[PDB]
Amino acid sequence: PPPDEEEQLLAKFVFGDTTDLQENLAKFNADFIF
Amino acid sequence: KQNRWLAVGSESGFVNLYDRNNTSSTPTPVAALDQLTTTISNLQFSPDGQILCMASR
Amino acid sequence: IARVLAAKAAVSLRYDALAEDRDDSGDIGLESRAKVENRLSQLEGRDLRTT
Amino acid sequence: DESDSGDINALTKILSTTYNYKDTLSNSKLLPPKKLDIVRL
Amino acid sequence: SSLSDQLAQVASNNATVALDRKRRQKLHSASLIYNSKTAATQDYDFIFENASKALEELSQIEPKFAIFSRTLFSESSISLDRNVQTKEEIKDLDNAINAYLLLASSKWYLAPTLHATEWLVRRFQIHVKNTEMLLLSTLNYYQTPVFKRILSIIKLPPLFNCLSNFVRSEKPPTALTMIKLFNDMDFLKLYTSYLDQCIKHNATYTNQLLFTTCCFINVVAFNSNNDEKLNQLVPILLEISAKLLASKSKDCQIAAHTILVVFATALPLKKTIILAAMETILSNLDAKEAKHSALLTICKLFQTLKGQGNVDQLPSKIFKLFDSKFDTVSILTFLDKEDKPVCDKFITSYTRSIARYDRSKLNIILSLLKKIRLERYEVRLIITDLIYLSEILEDKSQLVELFEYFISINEDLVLKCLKSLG
Amino acid sequence: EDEEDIALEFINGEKKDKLVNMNSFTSMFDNIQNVQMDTFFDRVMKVLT
């Protein structure tokens, strides 16, 4: 069965994943911040 | 036609320019040219009144 | 600046001492203060080093 | 993404069409202030 | 090219790799809060801890900063390195950095911003990679101590070498040199692009507009003697004026009012450019304070016109637009104030436009002429048009009164126009 | 009356203006701190007038 959300958080911390961050950078649209 | 400019020379090189169109015992000159440093021996306007040629011999 | 401030110091002073109906306002000095402040700005604004 | 197919963008348009931004001095009947167009004979 | 020259280009590309310990010391030593010796001793975790708190304070001042908490100031950002990423990823990082430098542009006076930017300087080496955006955002603080620190830790781009002297120098850069940096055209295109980004994001603030205005005005003055350069300046700076006028923010428009006026006096322009300028000015004129500044700008522009038709009537579209943003009562109030600027040519044009287009305002012509003394040539043009009006338009009490006014003052000129016309 | 008199009547009509020189807006930098844009707008006119 697929991982629970709270697992994905620990998995993010333990393995030090940065795919979540790189996604936000890609989604970063300047007009949205302004 | 009536003249609208008046220029008065001077040995020191100053040339005081007076606007005839605008009377008093003491009139204030519009400008006080001093580029020359010697006696003004010629003062002459262009026929239409847009250039003043000041010279020192 | 010492030369500029002293020269304007004399002018402001000679008005204080020798004025008959001087007002207690200091108007002449304030105008003198502006001229020194302007003279300081352009004097300091210059740079000796080539840019 | 782009195709052409009082408006605010009037000024930017008139800049595009014109190359010479200084009015011709031949038409005017006052001479320019600081520059003299003088030729020797 | 010599071997040394090519290797230099390799070094410049490879500036932030941190290949060996000595390189790691120079890179890690650069700082905006701390001296060199302490800087070498610190770790990324300690630096990030301060920034996380500092960003929180900025968030309270302005909610927009909270977004970067998810991207640049996240706990994952500690492990993030730029040298290891791909070309596509670094562009997104550069875009995120550039957006942040815009928000922090106005809050440099506050203490927390200087902490928050430390995280980017240490982690993302913006002082080496995003050098241009950092200097441009902090250009107006040139006398502030913060700007001095920025110079010391930053390698100047080719365009900013005017500041090369003021790196690690006690005196801050003088006002005069900033004019030199703006004087080069290439910088203006660069600054124009940065300024354009601010308008798109509505990130502008008064201090930036004041400083941006003061430099642009001065650049024209420094180029007053050289006509050919002034010609090259018009495409760039007037284009900025169109963008500033597009902005809703009033202070942006007023800066456009400053910058337009100085060209008009600095360089005579074609009427079409002048007329085009009015429409842009009047399109977005909503703020009262901008409204006052606009009317002075309109009058000042026409005074610079020195060609045939200088006092010709405005085009119909321009006339309707002007009256919408300035009713007849307003301009009479403008004509009232004793300290008015010279506006005779515009009023002559605005006068003739009424006769052509709006008959019922013809009474207002009487009031306008009395308030301001118009030039003789202007009055002659007004008489000539009103003569045609009587032949075409039906005779009116106001119409004859306008003549009757001209009868009272300078009667002889009235005959001359009538003699030439009828 | 003649056409020339109309032309000569323009030249009298035109009025003097203060040209912009290099050392005309230099002082702005000194007092460009904590001033609303509108005040700065007026001063530019003042030197220009």
Curated annotation (Swiss-Prot), chain C:
Domain of life: Eukaryota
Cell compartment(s), UniProt: Nucleus, Nucleolus
Note: Present with 34700 molecules/cell in log phase SD medium.
Protein role: Required for pre-18S rRNA processing. May bind microtubules.
Oligomeric form and interacting partners: Interacts with SIK1/NOP56 and NOP1. Interacts with the trimethylguanosine synthase TGS1. Component of the ribosomal small subunit (SSU) processome composed of at least 40 protein subunits and snoRNA U3.
Family: Belongs to the NOP5/NOP56 family.
Protein name per UniProt: Nucleolar protein 58
Organism name: Saccharomyces cerevisiae (strain ATCC 204508 / S288c) (Baker's yeast)
Gene designation per UniProt: NOP58
From Swiss-Prot, chain D:
Lineage: superkingdom: Eukaryota
Modified residues (Phosphoserine): S3, S5
Subcellular location(s) per record: Nucleus, Nucleolus
Oligomeric and partner information: Interacts with snoRNA U3. Interacts with MPP10, UTP21 and UTP25. Component of the ribosomal small subunit (SSU) processome composed of at least 40 protein subunits and snoRNA U3.
Other notes: Present with 9570 molecules/cell in log phase SD medium.
Family per similarity comment: Belongs to the WD repeat UTP18 family.
Role: Involved in nucleolar processing of pre-18S ribosomal RNA and ribosome assembly.
Name of the protein described by the UniProt record: U3 small nucleolar RNA-associated protein 18
The organism of origin for this protein: Saccharomyces cerevisiae (strain ATCC 204508 / S288c)
Gene that specifies this protein: UTP18
Whole-protein residues included: 180 to 238 of 594
Swiss-Prot record, chain E:
Residues modified to N-acetylserine: S1
Compartmental location: Nucleus, Nucleolus; Mitochondrion
Function text: Involved in nucleolar processing of pre-18S ribosomal RNA. Required for optimal pre-ribosomal RNA transcription by RNA polymerase I together with a subset of U3 proteins required for transcription (t-UTPs). Involved in ribosome biosynthesis.
Subunit organization: Interacts with snoRNA U3. Interacts with MPP10. Component of the ribosomal small subunit (SSU) processome composed of at least 40 protein subunits and snoRNA U3. In the absence of snoRNA3, forms a complex with other t-UTPs. This complex can associate with pre-18S ribosomal RNAs.
More details: Present with 18200 molecules/cell in log phase SD medium.
Sequence similarity: Belongs to the HEATR1/UTP10 family.
Protein name as annotated: U3 small nucleolar RNA-associated protein 10
Lineage start: Eukaryota, Fungi, Dikarya, Ascomycota, Saccharomycotina
Span of the entire protein shown here: 2 to 423 of 1769
Curated annotation (Swiss-Prot), chain F:
Localization terms from the record: Nucleus, Nucleolus
Disulfide partners: none
Further remarks about this protein from its record: Present with 6560 molecules/cell in log phase SD medium.
Role, per record: Involved in nucleolar processing of pre-18S ribosomal RNA. Required for optimal pre-ribosomal RNA transcription by RNA polymerase I together with a subset of U3 proteins required for transcription (t-UTPs).
Subunit structure: Interacts with snoRNA U3. Interacts with MPP10. Component of the ribosomal small subunit (SSU) processome composed of at least 40 protein subunits and snoRNA U3. In the absence of snoRNA3, forms a complex with other t-UTPs. This complex can associate with pre-18S ribosomal RNAs.
Protein name listed in UniProt: NET1-associated nuclear protein 1
This protein's encoding gene: NAN1
Span covered, complete protein: 848 to 896 of 896
